[model samples]
Target: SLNWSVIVPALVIVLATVVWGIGFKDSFTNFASSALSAVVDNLGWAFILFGTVFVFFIVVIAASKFGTIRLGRIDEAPEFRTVSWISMMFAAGMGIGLMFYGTTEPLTFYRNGVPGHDEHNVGVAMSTTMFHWTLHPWAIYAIVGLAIAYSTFRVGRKQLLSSAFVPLIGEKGAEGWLGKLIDILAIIATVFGTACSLGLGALQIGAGLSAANIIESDWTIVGIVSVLTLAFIFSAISGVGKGIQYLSNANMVLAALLAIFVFVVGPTVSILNLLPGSIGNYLSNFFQMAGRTAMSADGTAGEWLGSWTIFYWAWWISWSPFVGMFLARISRGRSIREFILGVLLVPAGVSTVWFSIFGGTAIVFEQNGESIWGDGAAEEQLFGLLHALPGGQIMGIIAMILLGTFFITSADSASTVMGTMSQHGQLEANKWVTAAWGVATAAIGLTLLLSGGDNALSNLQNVTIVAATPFLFVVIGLMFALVKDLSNDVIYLEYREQQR
Candidate 1:
């Protein structure tokens, strides 16, 4: 028999989207735009302020003597090759987003320049790029990882549902309806957030195909989304061990090959020169960037900061619950320090190198007038760099492969994680559940694609922001609970040893 519990809700959502699309396509577009505008205008500063403060705590913990203790240790032995593990983690966690924005993001900042600041130069642009992708974003991931790690490793918690937050919810209070409600919210957030991410992957895939000139019509967006949805459903049915793991491994290899090709073939000198400057700028302005709340009276500057910096922060945080749980599940037998370093430092380092290579190449092309700043510059940036190098056609083929694999990597990891949540951490039974999320994710992508690019993206982002609201508080509470749990574990271990 079909599981109506899953099939019915999904069918209903799909039906609703079809009905809405048929009846109020224009209205939906307006609603998406207006919702995003409201978010950017009012709640943007709140995210910035919260993100900045949250990152400050992360930095302090990372730097201080006791911070290591607070972060928790990885208990799993490192059996996999370090480089391979690092590559997989990085690709799974942030590779897709980096591919989507690595070339475009810097140019956006460079063109607009920082609002109200005369230093809207390359330095500022590089700094802003670092700000968005580095410590702060990674810190959000760490917070989520810490929560799950503490619950599973130290406190002997079972299940991956919101019951993972029982420490914060107080076991007695969380035993009944409250726990179920939390799980329900988490499920909703997982579905909606996964949909948003899938939509983004589809949109970027369309953009990439369009850039390649393979598709002649503007209808490529719908085409791409449809293709992705079908692919995801097939992959989902195959299950995670086969579909997700294979995709992640393939994605890592492709991404590494692309990065290496860029380093060797693309303006090697410019990328090298910019590396030190970007690093220095990131380090020097880290505090300032993290603290600037984007609440200033000047409308122009506030909008830019909110849309770019704050938006990225909030997006990362919104993704934390899902990513965190996933990270913790895979991270058994690893140390607390190892987990933190893996999540925060290693990924950020990879991102920095990526930005330096891809973004720096774009800056070089712009300086040389090889490409204009705004003329499909973002889409062309990757191609321009690839084409400028020797063996342009080969690089283009590789780039397309890499982009597709990265998307698959993200989808697979998210599917595995969500599946774990649905089955309450029973990886065996949850395998099918994970597949369900993958299909649902693709369906959302198709819906967005049929709707139009901007409208779909705006709606997805709005939904993500709303889903993130309560989880933000959950993350904050988790931080404190983690500390308590870790300390108690240490004391208990010591006591046991004393008796022995």
Candidate 2:
């Protein structure tokens, strides 16, 4: 049954956003920008601390006796194969942004340089990228993944954020106004967070089309967004087992093909050589990087982190509800230790390899004076890189297709997730509810793209970060609740009974 309490409020929020975005564009932009500044200035450290604490906390949990516990029944085998699980998770989690930012980020860091790092240092570009993409973000997702998975599969609760809060709020409160409010926050956060990615995908796909000389008008982006929105809505209603799973698997194949093509055609030796070196730099400098904060004496670190680290932390957290809940839904029958390891290691490792291939090739190209990083938007750089290589046209075509698939996968996944949240955490949300959310997210994304002046995308990003701020505390509470619930698990219960 549809949870009217949660669905109505979430729809109202989206409606308000549509009105504000269209009727008061400048005002919305100014308010969102100001709020974003406030978050970065005052509460940025909390985001930083959130990532660090979760990274360490999940590790400790996985290393303890609780690690042996299964996410579902002890004898239950995993529903999906390991390969499909990872592919789906990767598709939903970071695939879209990686496609959009792959070459652009490394080149941007290389050109402008990281704060306190030498300009034009390949190591700085690759290592900093790894720091942002790897362990920290995945660890953030793992927390919610574990919490929701354990609650839904192990404890047989509804797959709601409030379901994870039962231990903290007690069963009655969890099903009351408080529960409705948490689910509302999650729906809002998930919608806006996924909106940002949809915007990026639209921009890149539009840019790719222009690069291919297929379309030149800027307004084509609106058409692109509209078309993709329809595509994902249909896919979402197709159900997860078929729609999301197939697209995710297709994405991995496309991604691997694209990466391998570049690795072989581009500067192969430099990429191979840089892979281990980047990992080493990321490891050796891990503390210095993670410990960076606004507390610097000169205040320079503040701006840099606000732009990169803190922003990424907020993005990942905002995305956690959507990705985490989706992860839990798919990850039944996995042990806690296996789930943690798979969630943390596999995607992070793939990121390391991915950046080395795409980012490393871009850096090497720049060194050779090929100039792929010309005066263009970040979305254009990946195509530029591909075009600069042999079989350039073919590779660019593949990339555009890849971006489209990744975009569809992310939008479809988020739609299903929000649908699940809206219907009292029904494992199979009503199809119409899922389709409505799919359109709503796309509308919000389109509004942010077209209406917010020149800095529309930036405004969209800032809004997502602002939306995420409250949810940060919610995630922390979930950790506490998860631990309390696990303490009473049969594993521990049996031990206490023996002691008694």
Candidate 3:
């Protein structure tokens, strides 16, 4: 009952890329960069428009007559507790991101500035980071989650990305070659997206060890990836219900403690002072930030957006399949309203406070002229910030642990997610299938890490954005398809009948 039709093509393409990436490393890097330039130069606006509209659509649907519709049977209760559910989504969607970018994103914006924002203002930096982290990306994931959850749990369709398209494509079309292609696109997107992050997380973990005067060899990244690959694969084989969930819970607590440590030991009052102003800045500047395009600054903005804003949109969209599927799996019995709000708002709030604490503290140090903002690699900044605080060594270790845990949760979750898609929507996908993807994830991540020399992370990231372009339209189609399905929902029809 395996879906070789989907699995074979995806694996074949993935294998080809790996071979090309490994054998002709520089050629691969240049090819991907050239394509990325074309994509970002041409299609940056689409990422922005779709991102903003995704938020609009999810919010509108949730607040409309469909608000009362449940993801599963009308009387069914949620499968996971509310807190656990949110934690899982948080871990899958933004765990590594918050850790990696918490200090660096704000500091970069503060020191360098965006096109329209003040370069030296802490509030603008905070707000700009919020713009990237909050509403837009979560909304992107929420739409996919809503589509898949409603399709599988409410409508009793298979747990496949293409299954959500049945309303638009018809069952025959959705289940045919067209459907297979969509699933393949999603699987490919998930692979590269998660692999890009795995490379990043590994880099950060290696950097943490270096800061503590531990191992700092040239082969550190390879060693880290190889070691964690085994751990994440074991977690994947243990299944999401056990491994991903437990790790997510533990990571949440560890992350909270780390954030609190920074807040308390770094600059407590400054963080408190920055909170309200950052929120206000983000709210006031939301439109301009959302509407920014390469054209905003006579082509200079293109470079910036390609590297930052537009790149993030593509990354989030690429990740939607993995994160969206994980969100849907845990979101049964929830109302469309609850699902949308929980997915969109709560995490955004957490991200805001997280940046405020970590980002805010980092800015305070920068103003004092002893900061690591421009002095080191991006991965080193968090450890730099931590070491400057009290109990620095201890806090740095905790932060590293958090990063490692997030790494495991993300990789394992993605493997399970890809397994489900490849196995024709088996909720509890075959263990062997999950294990295969788990190994593939490690191989791609390691390839990216070693193949590009010093530019490994950036090159892999650029390739992922270019590769994710097709899935952008997939999200667009899923949105329209969801609208069609929700419009014809029995609950909405009953409401209309009562009105008549």
Candidate 4:
């Protein structure tokens, strides 16, 4: 039966975004930001606390008796090959983040320093950025992914958020209003989080166009996203996810070549000394950075945090619904041990090295007194790095095109997932529903930006973090359910009794 479940949730975000951008304006932006700030200000501790909770749960489980359990039965294997597994896992865990923050965040920490550190400590900058990019975020995603996989693959439950809650909330509570609430929250997290991606993509594209001297100013970004609104509609109507995924690779390789160009230019000799020095320093400070926060400090600490640590923690949480769901679907048939180790280490390992190269280079350059990095809008910061490289014009165009496809891939994927959620977890969503979502997401991103340029960016961060707040509690409940499920598993129960 057609119901408000689908229509109202979709339109709530959709219509509010339209009304905000097209009408209400300041009130929504202010309200969203205030709530975000209040959450972070009041619950700043929650970000650190819950993030650590996920970390502890994942590590302990992987090392404990539960680690040996197979995602399937005792000895089946994963559906995807290892290389493909690594690559696709990389896709969900990373993307727009590396492009947007790769250079900028290290540089940001360099200029502003982290929450508790001195403003110019290069060591803190490198390590703090690494802290933001690594472990904790993955832990958040893994919590949700493992819960879904453990339940759906082993015992065969419905593929829904509420279903994961059955053990914790009881089947009746899980199916009734309580369950719907979790699914709706999941949908909210996916929609706002994904719309943020679209807003980011549009902002970068507009900024990139400005950098190329293509568009004098991005006053036309709304017009540009409006163009995307139609372009994406056609894509939804035409099956675009398949094509975007491929072009995704082409741009990555293209971007990698340009990265090699800069590495070869190799600016200085202590530069040679600095290349690995910063990474070493970052690792040195890794745990220290992880534990610092505004909770014990004030003023600059709080302000810096609103934009940095708390914002990112929120970003990844909000993102978990979409990314975590994507991870859960692909992660069947692996062992709990393998999944834990793989999810925890692979991408985090990759980030350390990649950031060492891209972000490390930017840090080294600024140290040697060149400005290959700048305090531009986050989007412009990446562009600044490319413009300083060989065939600056060529690299800029390549990056522009690369991010465009990356942007398109992200926007469409989120819209598609929300469509499924809105349709009550139906994989085959109506094309009209999906397209309506595509346009709505673009509208959310565009108007969210239109509300107030960079300030709006902060608002996106706040909304993500706030939207993810309850989901963090959900992740905790998920841990309870997964532990109970594992306790009752025949293999685990049998092994404990027989071996003991």
Candidate 5:
């Protein structure tokens, strides 16, 4: 049942670390990186196709008359309210991202620019940030969420990733070797992706303190990571309804207030102006950006392009089994149209606004030639910028508190999701089960970070994208099975029978 074939890679990582401590050479990770590069070089177009096709598929399906199709039966009510549901989805999908890259990604892309874009424009940088965070990522989540929710609730299948493939594979097929393989892939992807997230969150939290003239020791990162792990472990023990959900609710609100604080404190007028400009630029270049491949950037640009763009795609897809399933569990009874629109647009808007407030203001500071603290240390930039504001010290305090909780909420939720996947999609997770996942996730986060030279994040990204490669194939298969199942919906059949 462990799908021992797919489980071997992840299982070895844990056992090897236990045998040799956290700092053993990363031979396995590097292998994934090299293999991933070769695959991207050869199959760049396939990755590009995988990214773009989902957007088109979703638009047509939601706009078709089937928009009203409920994921469950027509009479069923949603599990949570609109606000509560949105908050949970935001916590899972958004997680620690905006806090991690609120300043970094835009600033990086500002110099890099789009390969064909006119020049280094702030709008372009923010647009690039929006492109990564918006429609594309969420669309991937929407498909998997729709598939999972429909399969578990509507079709009476067990709440497992493998169940969604029933359309392509009959009931026995779903419970056979193929199903176990699919579930194993989901577990590995979630484990690494969540670890990367935990690592990023820890780095930023440590950086926040180091930026404030505090904690100068090399062990600062270790201390911060330890506290962060313990916090999430505590949160995980409280169960999802109170612990994860409460943390999510606080995270969403705090993140919103934080966005507002940056907007007002950094450059209120400039940020307000950027809302329409970045969104406009994002829409104008949506297709061009979405359609980008390694081929698109090859001759005119460098190979590093695949590392950034394709890695981001692979990371999100790697996260799909967890984020999408979390999304499915929370989004019980929404219509196909409502689910697509809300999941795609709402979170997309939140991320766009976040980038604009944080990313937008940082660019404005650069344009004015005032060091709003954006260069050098990438993770420290946001707090640095905020540290220069009125009552800035207080803002820094809040920012640290906020980011610490952001990762805690994400780690708390992710550990539970890992436990759920490990146990065949069970709703409840035992304390040992969840805590074991939580500890291993934190250990890997620290292991991968400490093992790399200057590019811990990128190394982590490389391994995750490779880890997700199998799941990418699984997502396309899930997509095919989903369409097949949707075509056979009982309600659609019921309507056809009524006409008789």
Candidate 6:
């Protein structure tokens, strides 16, 4: 029997989004614009402040000698094999967005100062890039992973809602309407967030295909959405064990291959040289950049930083609920320390490598006066850089496949997470729930396409940020709850064993 409890609600959401697209298009567009800007401003600050704090916690944890703790009586340890765990984390976190933005984001940063500086010089621009993606975004992931790991592994919570915050609300409270509201909000967030992300992915893939002269239709937007929706449906039907894992694994392999190709075939020396400087620059500015709220002495720099870096940070936090739950689900039998380090440090390291190779190649190409990427928008720059690379044709093929797989993986995992949330963590009973989310996502993509191109995406992203306002409080509440719970657990364990 199909799970109506899960399926019905999901279908209703999808149907409603479709109706909104068709009926009150102009009103919806206007609402999206005003609401999203406010969302970006408020949540952007929340992420900047909290993400900075979170990074400091990670540094302390890493430096602490007592990083690893025993995982009960089990002999099996959480695997720290860099290739498998770290690589998989990057694959899962990045998805198709990396390919789309890997080159462009750095260049964009290079063109714009770290949010406030009007001087579009290379040094400041690169610093802005490092500020946005490398530092703050990864910290957002760490917070999410930590919340999920603590709740599931430490407290033995079976439900996948923000049970991480149960200590503040109390366990009974977690099972009440308030908790359900949180989960339902999370579900909605996941759908909209994933829809925005997947829509961007589809647009990029379409752009790449168009660049290669493979697809000759202005309906590239529609075509890509349709293809992605189908992919999501197939993966959703296959379930997480088979579909998500396989797609994740494939994504990693393809990403690795692309990285290797870029290193070997592109401006190898420039790419390698850029890494040391990028890393040095990133580490040096890490603290200053983290604390920046674009409310500093210079209003212009502050506004720029707020719009770009702060916006990205908020986007990451908004995504935390879905990503955190997914990470927690896969992270069974892992220690608190392992989960935090893996989610924070490892993924950041991989992203650094990715940005260095891909972005550096673009820088080199631009310096050499090769206009592979036209001087259009940031998105256009990424496609142009990819096309300008030494072996872009073959790499483009790999990128397209990789991009498709990444989108599918994200959609499938998101669908699975949403399903789990709706059914109170019953994966089997939530198949239709997953399917319904997939369809809803597709519908959202369609809506965006109908509305316009990047405008639709930007609107959705902004709305998602607005929707995530409540989550900021939820995250803070969860942190306090976690510290209390962990302290108690440690005391109880020590008491039994008579150890400090």
Q: Encode model 1's per-residue lDDT on 1-500: one tens digit a residue.
A: 22234334445655565456434674674466466566666766667666766666655554554344422343335445667657657754456577767877776666666764454377877888998888777787777776676676656675554546575667746645555555545555566566666666666656556657665755655555446555755444464346666666677677778787888877788888888989899888777666565544345566566456755766776677677776666566555666676777777787788898877777777677765354653444566566777786677767766666655555666666656655555555454565666666665555554565445555555555655666666666666765555545665558767888
CA RMSD per model (angstroms):
4.1, 2.3, 2.3, 2.9, 3.0, 3.5
lDDT of 2 by residue, 1-500 (tens): 77888878888988887777766555865576676788788888888876788989899999998988988897688988989777666655447888877788888888888877788998878888988998898888889999999988998888898889988998646767687788999998888888888888888777787877665557656656557556655745655447766777788788878889999999999989987888999898788787778875377888788777887888888899987986787788888988898888878887888888888899888888887885857777889899888888898888888777776777777888898887777777766777788878887777777665556666766777877888889888888998988897876978888899
How far is 263's C-alpha from truth in model 5 (Å)? 1.3
A best-first ranking of the candidates according to their lDDT comes to: 3, 2, 5, 4, 6, 1
Q: Which is better, 4 or 5, measured by lDDT?
A: 5
Model 4: how large is the Cα RMSD against the reference?
2.9
Task: Tell me how far the alpha carbon of residue 345 in candidate 5 is from the true structure, in angstroms, after superposition.
Answer: 1.3
Return the TM-score for each candidate structure.
Answer: 0.85, 0.94, 0.94, 0.91, 0.91, 0.87
TM-score of 3: 0.94
Candidate 4 lDDT tens digits, 1-500:
23356457657866765676545566666576676678877888888777767888889988988888888666778899878888876676557667777777888778666666677676777677777777788887787788878777787776677777787888646756677778777777777777777777666667777787665545566567446644854553566446547765775686576556556754534335644765687668766666677754555577777788888888888888777667777787888887888888887866775566667677776776776655567777777777776676777777777667666677666766677776656767676676666766666666667666557566556656766787777777877888888887876678878988
Give Cα-based local distance difference scores for all models: 0.64, 0.81, 0.82, 0.71, 0.73, 0.64
The weakest ten consecutive residues by lDDT in model 2 span 232-241
Residue 395 accuracy (lDDT) in model 5 = 76
Can you give the lDDT of residue 207 in candidate 2? 74
Off by over 4 Å in 5: 1-21, 27-35, 213-220, 235-241, 297-304, 373-375, 491-500
Candidate 3, 1-500: lDDT as tens digits: 78989899899988877787766554755577776688887777789888899988989999997778888897688888988777666665457778888889899888888987667788778778999999998899999989999999888999899999998888746777688899999999999888878778887887787877665556755656457655656744554447766777898789889888888887799998887988899998898888888877776788888888988899899899987887787788898899898988777878888999888888889899877764758888998888888798898889888877777777787888999998889887877778788778767777777676677667767877976899999999999999988887876767878998
- Model 4 earns a TM-score of 0.91
lDDT of 5 by residue, 1-500 (tens): 32344346556655564334344555565555667677777656666787878787877778886677887876677878988877665665556777888777887677666776755578778777887888888888888888898898888787778889988978646766688778777877787788777778777777777766664655546546556556556645755347765666677777777788888777898888988998999898888777665555555533755766677788788788777877787778878888888888778877877888888877777777765554577777878778767776777778777777766666777777777777667777666677766777777677666655456666666666766777888888888888878877886767777887
Candidate number with the higher lDDT (2 or 5) = 2
Worst 10 residues of 1 by lDDT: 66-75
Residues 111-205 of candidate 6 have per-residue lDDT tens digits of 44345445435555455576666656665566666666666666667556557667767676665656656666666666777776777776776
Model 5 lDDT, residue 95, Cα: 66
